[PDB]
C-alpha cells in the first residue's frame, strides 16, 4: 500500500501543472507525520509545497523505479519516463541520470525541450546553485539553436535566461554557477552582440549596488566591458571605463571593507592600462 | 566588520585521529535509503573520499575491499566509462574516481584498462577541452580529470598533450587564476584543477607562481582558513585546494600554517568525529578527506604524505610511478 | 543590504514584553517565511534579556546581524540585517524610532503594551524605507553620538548565553516559536 501512495503524488504533481502553468517555486514544508487524506503536494496560488513526511518514502521510490529504466529490469511508459524524471529533480537537481534520461526524450522528439526549461527554472529556487541543472540548461540551449543579429525567438530566449541567473543570484550570495552560466550565454546565444551587452550593463548597475561582497556579480561587470572591446577594431568605451571607475568608488565610500570592490577597482585600472 | 569565522577557546586544537577513523568506518552503516538515494550520484566519489582518509591514517584495511572492487566492476559500461554508481551514466568525475580506488588498492586489472583509456579519447575536442560525459559539458575539472586517470594508467600520450595544455592555458585570467571555460570567474577550485594538470602535462614554468600564488594568499582570513573566492567564508574543502595548489606553485610558505593548521582542527568533532566545513556545522566524509590532507600538507607527522595533485598517499603514487614535478 | 527585522521592545524584571514590529521576509523562500519571522521575534527578546540598561551590543552569526539599542530607560529595540548592511547606519534608524516611540506612546502604556494595543504604523514604512542606506535622513545631532560610543560584539549567540545555558533547549522551551518552526530549527542546524 506505500506503493500507492507515491503514485498518488506523482499525479497530484503532473496534475499540479494542469491547475497552474505557471508556477513561482517549489518548497518544503516540516509535517512530521501525513494529514488525514490530504496530499502531501500543497499549492497555494503560485507556490508550491511539499510535505517531509513525503520525501522519505517518495525520493527513494522514484529514485528506485528510474534505475530499473537504465538497466532494463523494468519498461516505464513514454508518459511515465516524463512523470519520474520530473518529481526526482524537484527534489535532487543534482541526479545526472535523471537529465540524461530528459536529453534522450528530447533528442528522440518525444518531450518538448522548454519544458526542461521550465522545470529547470523550478529546480533554480531550491536549488539554486545546482551545477547539474545549469549543465544540463546549456545543452538544451545549445540545442535549441540550428534546428549578425540573432533571431527575436532568441532574443526572447536569452533575456530569458537572464532573468533566472539574476533570480538564483538572489538567493545564493555570489553564486558562481548562476553568473558563470549568464556568461556562457552571451558567448553563444548572444555571440558577444555590442546592444545586448550595454542593456545589460544598467540592469546590472542596481543591484551591484544593492550586493557588494558578490565578486561572481560584479566579474559579470568585467565581461561585458572585454567583450566590448574585442569587437571594436559607435558608443565611447573609455567613457564607459570613466563611469565604471566612478561608480566603484562611490560604492567604496559609501561601504568600505569590501575586497570585491578593490578587486573590481584592479579589474577596472587593467583594463584601462591596456588600450594604449 | 570582514566575512569571516571566529574560532572559540574551547574548540577542538588537537588532532583526533582516533575518531577520524571510527566515524568513516561507522559511516552508511545506518540503513537511510534517503541519504543514499540523495548521495549516490557521486558515491564513486563517495568511496574516494571514505578510502583515501583510511588510507592516511592507515587504516584502509578496516574498509571492505572486495565488496568496493566488485562494486566498480559493476558500474564500468559498454562504452568503457564507469559511473557514479549501479545503473547511472558514465562520467569523468567516476572514472577518475574508480581509477584512483582502483590504484590503492592495486587492483587496476580489474576493469578493461583499454576501454578507459579510449572512453578519455572520445570526449577531447578539436581545441584541446574535454567533457565531462558524451553529452559535451565543457570544464577545466575534466581537463583535469583526463589527464589524471591516464597518468595513473600510464597513458598520459593516448590524448592530444599538446592541444589540452593549449585550451587549460587560455583559460587563465588577470589575477593569474583559471576558471570553467575561457572567460570565466577565476575560481579555486578550478585553480586546483588546472594547476594539477599543468603539473602532469609538466608545464608548470608557464605559471606566473608569484602572481596565481598572490592571488591564493589573499584567499586567508584572520580566522586562519582559507575561501575559493573573495568575500567567502573560509571552508576546509578550499582550504585544501588553496593549500595544495600552493604546493603545487611552490610557494606554499607564503601563507600562515599555525594559524590554518588552528582553524583544520577546530572543524572537528569531538563527540562523533570527522570534519565539517566551518565550526560547528555537520560533519561528512567529504571534509573529512579535505581536513586531513590539509592537516598532512602542512607537515601532521601522524598523517601519511599526501599528494597535492592526485589528493593520495604518496607511498601509493610512489608504487606506480607517477610524481609530476613540482616548482621548487 | 536588506532589513529583516525591526521590532520595538520593553524589558521589565519578569521577561521582555514585545511592544511593536515589522518584518520583511521577502528574501527569504516561501515556506520558511512564517518560521524565520518568529526566530527573528525569538532571538529580539534574549537579544533585550541580557543587554543591560543603557548600553549597546551587536551579535554577528552567519547571515544575521542582529543590532540593539537598549537605552537608559526600559524599553529598547532590535533590529536584524545582513552583514553586508552597514553596522552604525543601523543604529540612525534605531535611535530615531526610539524617539519618535516616546512621543506616541506614554510611559503607562510601556510595561502592558502589546502589537494589537501599541498605536504606531511607522515601523513597516521605515522597515521599507530605510531598505537602502542611499536614501536616509542624516541626522548629525546623533550621528556624532554615535561615533563616540564603541559597540560590544558577540561572536555567537551562545556569547551571551550562561556558560550551561544551550540555544537549542531555549528554542524548544520557548513560548512564541511554534511547533513548525520548533521542527523547523532542529532540521535547519543538523542539516548544515
Ligand atoms: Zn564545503
Redesign the interface.
Known amino acids: 500500500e506505500v506503493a500507492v501512495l507515491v503514485q498518488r503524488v506523482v499525479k497530484d504533481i503532473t496534475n499540479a501543472f494542469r491547475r497552474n502553468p505557471h508556477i513561482?517555486?517549489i518548497?518544503?514544508?516540516?509535517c512530521?507525520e501525513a494529514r488525514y487524506n490530504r496530499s502531501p503536494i500543497v499549492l497555494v496560488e503560485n507556490?508550491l509545497?511539499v510535505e517531509?513526511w513525503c520525501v522519505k518514502f517518495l525520493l527513494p521510490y522514484v529514485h528506485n523505479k528510474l534505475l530499473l529504466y537504465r538497466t532494463r529490469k523494468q519498461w516505464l511508459n513514454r508518459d511515465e519516463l516524463i512523470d519520474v524524471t520530473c518529481t526526482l529533480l524537484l527534489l535532487n537537481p543534482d541526479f545526472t541520470t535523471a537529465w540524461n534520461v530528459r536529453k534522450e526524450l528530447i533528442l528522440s522528439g518525444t518531450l518538448n525541450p522548454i519544458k526542461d526549461l521550465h522545470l529547470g527554472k523550478l529546480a533554480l529556487?531550491?536549488f539554486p546553485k545546482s551545477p547539474e541543472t545549469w549543465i544540463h540548461r546549456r545543452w538544451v540551449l545549445q540545442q535549441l539553436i540550428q534546428e549578425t543579429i540573432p533571431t527575436e525567438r532568441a532574443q526572447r530566449l536569452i533575456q530569458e535566461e537572464m532573468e533566472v541567473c539574476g533570480e538564483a543570484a538572489?538567493?545564493y550570495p555570489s553564486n558562481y554557477n548562476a553568473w558563470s552560466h549568464r556568461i556562457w550565454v552571451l558567448q553563444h546565444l548572444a555571440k558577444l552582440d555590442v546592444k545586448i551587452l550595454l542593456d545589460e550593463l544598467s540592469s546590472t548597475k542596481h543591484w551591484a549596488?544593492?550586493?557588494?561582497?558578490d565578486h561572481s556579480g560584479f566579474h559579470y561587470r568585467q565581461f561585458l566591458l572585454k567583450s566590448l572591446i574585442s569587437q571594436t577594431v559607435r558608443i565611447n568605451l573609455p567613457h564607459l571605463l570613466e563611469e565604471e571607475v566612478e561608480f566603484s568608488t562611490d560604492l567604496i565610500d559609501?561601504?568600505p571593507g569590501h575586497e570585491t570592490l578593490w578587486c573590481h577597482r584592479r579589474h577596472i585600472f587593467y583594463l584601462q592600462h591596456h588600450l594604449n | 566588520?570582514q566575512?569571516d569565522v571566529?574560532i572559540?577557546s574551547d574548540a577542538p586544537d588537537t588532532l583526533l585521529l582516533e575518531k577520524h577513523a571510527d566515524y568513516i568506518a561507522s559511516y552508511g552503516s545506518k540503513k537511510d535509503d534517503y541519504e543514499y538515494c540523495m548521495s549516490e550520484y557521486l558515491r564513486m566519489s563517495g568511496i574516494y573520499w571514505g578510502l583515501t582518509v583510511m588510507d592516511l591514517m592507515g587504516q584502509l584495511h578496516r574498509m571492505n575491499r572486495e565488496e568496493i572492487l566488485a562494486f566498480i566492476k559493476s558500474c564500468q559500461h559498454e562504452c568503457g566509462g564507469i559511473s557514479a554508481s549501479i545503473g547511472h551514466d558514465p562520467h569523468l568525475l567516476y572514472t577518475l574516481s574508480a581509477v584512483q580506488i582502483l590504484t590503492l588498492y592495486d587492483s587496476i586489472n580489474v576493469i578493461d584498462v583499454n576501454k578507459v583509456v579510449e572512453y578519455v579519447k572520445g570526449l577531447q575536442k578539436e581545441d584541446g577541452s574535454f567533457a565531462g560525459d558524451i553529452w559535451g559539458e565543457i570544464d577545466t575539472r575534466f581537463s583535469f580529470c583526463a589527464v589524471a586517470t591516464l597518468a595513473l594508467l600510464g597513458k598520459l600520450d593516448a590524448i592530444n598533450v599538446e592541444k589540452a595544455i593549449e585550451f587549460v592555458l587560455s583559460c587563465m585570467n588577470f589575477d593569474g587564476g583559471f576558471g570553467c571555460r575561457p572567460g570565466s570567474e577565476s575560481h579555486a577550485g578550478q585553480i586546483y584543477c588546472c594547476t594539477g594538470f599543468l603539473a602532469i602535462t609538466s608545464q608548470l614554468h608557464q605559471v606566473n607562481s608569484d602572481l596565481l600564488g598572490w592571488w591564493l594568499c589573499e584567499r586567508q582570513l584572520p580566522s586562519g582558513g582559507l575561501n575559493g573566492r573573495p568575500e567567502k567564508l573560509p571552508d576546509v574543502c578550499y582550504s585544501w585546494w588553496v593549500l595544495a595548489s600552493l604546493k603545487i606553485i611552490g610557494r606554499l610558505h607564503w601563507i600562515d600554517r599555525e594559524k590554518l593548521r588552528n582553524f583544520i582542527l577546530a572543524c572537528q568533532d569531538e563527540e562523533t568525529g570527522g570534519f565539517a566545513d566551518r565550526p560547528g556545522?555537520?560533519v561528512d566524509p567529504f571534509h573529512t578527506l579535505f581536513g586531513i590532507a590539509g592537516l598532512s600538507l602542512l607537515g601532521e607527522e601522524q598523517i601519511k604524505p599526501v599528494n597535492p595533485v592526485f589528493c593520495m598517499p604518496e607511498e601509493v603514487l610512489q608504487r606506480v610511478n607517477v610524481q609530476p614535478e613540482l616548482v621548487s | 543590504?536588506k532589513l529583516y527585522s525591526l521590532s520595538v521592545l520593553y524589558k521589565g524584571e519578569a521577561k521582555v514584553v514585545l511592544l511593536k514590529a515589522a518584518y520583511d521576509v521577502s528574501?527569504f523562500?516561501?515556506?520558511?517565511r512564517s518560521?524565520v519571522q518568529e526566530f527573528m521575534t525569538f532571538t529580539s527578546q534574549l537579544i533585550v534579556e541580557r543587554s543591560s540598561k543603557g548600553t549597546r551590543a551587536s551579535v554577528?552569526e552567519q547571515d544575521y546581524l542582529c543590532h540593539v539599542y537598549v537605552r537608559n530607560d526600559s524599553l529598547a529595540g532590535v533590529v536584524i540585517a545582513d552583514?553586508?548592511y552597514?553596522?552604525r547606519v543601523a543604529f540612525t534608524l534605531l535611535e530615531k524610532v526610539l524617539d519618535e516611540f516616546s512621543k506616541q506612546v506614554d510611559r503607562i502604556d510601556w510595561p502592558v503594551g502589546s502589537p494589537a494595543t501599541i498605536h504606531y504604523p511607522a515601523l513597516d514604512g521605515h522597515l521599507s524605507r530605510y531598505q537602502?542606506?542611499?536614501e536616509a535622513d542624516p541626522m548629525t545631532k546623533v550621528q556624532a553620538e554615535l561615533d563616540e560610543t564603541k559597540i560590544i560584539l558577540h561572536?555567537?549567540m551562545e556569547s551571551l548565553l550562561e556558560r550551561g545555558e544551550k540555544l537549542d533547549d531555549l528554542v524548544s522551551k520557548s513560548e512564541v516559536l511554534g511547533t513548525?518552526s520548533k521542527?523547523?530549527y532542529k532540521?535547519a542546524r543538523?542539516?548544515?
Not at chain 1, 209 to 213: F, Y
Not at chain 3, 29 to 32: A, G, L, R, V
Open positions: 513561482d517555486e518548497g518544503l514544508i516540516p512530521p507556490k509545497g517531509s529556487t531550491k538572489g538567493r549596488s544593492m550586493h557588494v561582497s559609501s561601504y | 566588520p566575512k571566529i572559540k556545522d555537520m | 543590504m528574501s523562500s516561501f515556506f520558511q518560521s554577528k552583514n553586508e552597514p553596522s537602502n542606506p542611499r561572536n555567537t513548525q521542527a523547523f532540521t543538523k542539516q548544515n
